[PDB]
Every structure is written in structure tokens, then in C-alpha cells.
């Protein structure tokens, strides 16, 4: 029940829509939150060091 690891799901669930009309890719909020989680873990490591 206590979660200490996170299963990131396959790229099938998370779309990456490269908007050809612009220089960008529409991305799921889940991928952004995964990026934020990785950043948080790394900055926690940095602050511990």
C-alpha cells in the first residue's frame, strides 16, 4: 500500500502530438508530472548532499 516506486505507463497511453503548424509538441499533463517527479527526486538528492 505504501508507494515507494512509480510505474510510468507505456507511450501508448501518453500521446506526443507534434503540432506541425508550430515548433512544439502537445504533451499529456501526466508526462509533465512525471518530469516534475524526477526533478523533485533529483533535487531532494541534491539537498541531501
Partner 1 sequence: RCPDCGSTELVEDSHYSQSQLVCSDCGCVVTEGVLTTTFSDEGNLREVTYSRSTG
Nearer CB in complex with partner 1: 4/23: 23
Q: Is 24 in the site for partner 1 (CB under 8 A)?
A: yes
Q: Among 8, 9, 28, 43, which residue interacts with partner 1 (rule: CB under 8 A)? A: 28
Alpha helices in the chain (DSSP H): 29-48
**Which of 6, 18 has the CB closer to partner 1?**
18
- Residue count of the chain, please give it: 49
Of 16, 43, 19, the closest CA to residue 30 belongs to 16
| Contact between residue 9 and residue 22 where contact means Cβ atoms under 8 Å apart | no
- Note the residues at the interface with partner 1 (CB under 8 A): 15, 17, 19, 22-29
Amino acid at each position: 500500500l505504501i508507494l515507494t516506486r512509480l510505474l510510468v505507463p507505456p507511450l501508448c497511453i501518453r500521446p506526443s502530438v507534434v503540432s506541425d503548424l508550430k515548433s512544439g509538441t502537445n504533451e499529456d499533463d501526466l508526462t509533465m508530472k512525471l518530469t516534475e517527479i524526477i526533478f523533485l527526486n533529483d533535487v531532494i538528492k541534491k539537498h541531501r548532499i
